[PDB]
Design a protein around this ligand. Structure first.
Ligand SMILES: C[C@H](NC(=O)c1ccccc1C(F)(F)F)c1nnc(SCCOc2ccc(F)cc2)n1Cc1ccc(F)cc1
Ligand SMILES: C[C@H](NC(=O)c1ccccc1C(F)(F)F)c1nnc(SCCOc2ccc(F)cc2)n1Cc1ccc(F)cc1
Lengths: 306, 306
């Protein structure tokens, strides 16, 4: 006996969920438009039921806000609407956190209950390269201490406060650095998705996940993520690495075989250990774990018992 | 702005609040049953409203479980009813956690949504004195490592799993040790309250506060808790210390003056440092912070915005 309800591919797919849960052609066009060669069959058979389950929790939290406001005879110091409902998205580099997150942002905005949905990545809260250097942490980008934890906690707290205005900094992956002067403004959305390696990480004191209303961990066999990491790396030889401004131009194209080999070594030396030491242990902390098989198709969902 | 809604005493009192909330006389009689000279005016004027607020969260969770079971077309692997709703209660030694906990236990069982409310203290998860010897930890009794944290995690996990049967050990304060062979059995309650110094403490992997649905922190100025710790040590001269089976039986023989000196020492040397290091840093992780005046009456509630 476990604290999770477990579903295989078959039962999950088996949309007994008696909304004829099917997207329209307008929407499917829109969803192509996040093109990580996105498989619209998974969006409709898997991510749509998931947006639905999460929808039930957001709507529940919204009536609990109403009932509670009514009970407290709605006094001045109580807010006028619910604060943003915050979803955390965690997993290894290259498992597809960002794609999952973008898809949920899109699906969840479909309901009139919560149409304004924001997405922030914790990437924006890494220390600038210059600062990482000052601390001797360059070889540790994406490990817990390479993030300005205070700023990230201030950011999320302010969002949970129901501020009209919360600012995050912006990270360019192209430049391998924080963009000086850039800011993403978040203005009391109904939902805010927060995606990052570290979102479910444990801290001595108050931590970001203490402000999450729901959380998701994207999982896969460690070997399978290695393969996805390697492939994205070779593929980047065009798209990004090719660009002159790319911090990683000194790789831009140096033999497929030698790119495989370097990718494997960056994986084994940085990203894989960050996974074992720091990310995987946060897995049992998620409300929902999604396990994908070799070709990114979901084969197992574990959902915390309500 | 902050993540908290704040009430002072008068505001909380003002139960012109959308429902009449008064206790009946059979209720007030029952509530005297634990009447360590319980202030029954506070019980009806502060704790009743507090239990109502919590009830709203319990009932929300019950509906969400049903809306969710129906969306999932109710599978064999989803449980038939909600699993226990778990409330944590934390704060210093002598701050009145146990009283607080016992007053919400009886009050919450008032509603037919959730009549079966249990109470467990984490004291039952301290290592027995003998195992605490092997480890050189007798001087750290009540510090995070004096607990069998693995068994405490297993116990709370098993309850959140909806199992019919979960056993906690039993601590005797009289004998200053775990009673060998004795067990408290928990059998799928609607609500389980978990009271302890350590309930909201952080750790690297999964931690018990992950499995909570609501949590309370009982608060006061450190001066005042010292005053209550001291008063209770003196008072115990007559009561528990007087028992000849009392592990602290030699404390019965203490003059007032000697008792003040000794109590003041145990405090400023063991309990006060535990408060400052391990217990007080957990205060912002609570859903609700109850602050008490020197006289034991509540004077601030801080509640997390919904
Ligand atoms: C460790 C570093 N981490 C990140 O850049 C990073 C840091 C924080 C969040 C995400 C990421 C990212 F997804 F991009 F991997 C990394 N992990 N992979 C690389 S290569 C440049 C980015 O390339 C890829 C390749 C595949 C991929 F799936 C995502 C990004 N780096 C930069 C780097 C290369 C060599 C070296 F010796 C030190 C660093
Ligand atoms: C630090 C210790 N803590 C625990 O026993 C303990 C451990 C876990 C939870 C609760 C408690 C308790 F509240 F009872 F204090 C303690 N704190 N107070 C004492 S004296 C016996 C219990 O007396 C009181 C006195 C006041 C009070 F509010 C609660 C308990 N001890 C045992 C002890 C005495 C002398 C010495 F040198 C070392 C230890």
């Amino acid at each position: 006996p476990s604290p999770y309800v477990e579903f295989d591919r078959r039962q999950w797919r088996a949309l007994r969920m008696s909304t004829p849960l099917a997207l329209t052609e307008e929407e499917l066009v829109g969803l192509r438009g996040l093109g990580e060669q996105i498989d619209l069959l998974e969006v409709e058979e898997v991510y749509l039921p998931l947006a639905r389950l999460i929808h039930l929790q957001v709507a529940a939290r919204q009536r609990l806000f109403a009932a509670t406001a009514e009970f407290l005879g709605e006094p001045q110091q109580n807010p006028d609407r619910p604060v943003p409902f915050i979803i955390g998205v965690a997993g290894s580099v290259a498992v597809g956190k960002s794609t999952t997150a973008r898809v949920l942002q899109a699906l969840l905005a479909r309901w009139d209950h919560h149409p304004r949905v924001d997405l922030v990545t914790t990437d924006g809260f890494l220390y600038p390269n210059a600062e990482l250097q000052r601390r001797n942490l360059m070889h540790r980008k994406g490990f817990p201490e390479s993030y300005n934890r205070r700023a990230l906690m201030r950011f999320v707290t302010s969002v949970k406060s129901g501020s009209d205005y919360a600012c995050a900094p912006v990270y360019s992956h192209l430049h391998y650095d924080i963009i000086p002067g850039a800011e993403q403004v978040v203005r009391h959305p109904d939902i805010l998705i927060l995606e990052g390696l570290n979102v479910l990480q444990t801290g001595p004191t108050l931590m970001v996940s203490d402000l999450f209303d729901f959380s998701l961990y994207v999982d896969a066999r460690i070997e399978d993520i290695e393969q996805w990491y390697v492939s994205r790396f070779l593929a980047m030889r065009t798209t990004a690495f090719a660009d002159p401004e790319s911090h990683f131009h000194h790789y831009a194209a140096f033999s497929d075989s030698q790119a495989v080999v370097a990718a494997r070594e960056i994986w084994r030396t940085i990203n894989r250990p960050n996974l074992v030491e720091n990310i995987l242990p946060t897995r049992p902390r998620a409300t929902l774990v999604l396990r994908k098989d070799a070709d990114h198709s979901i084969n197992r969902l574990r959902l915390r018992k309500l």
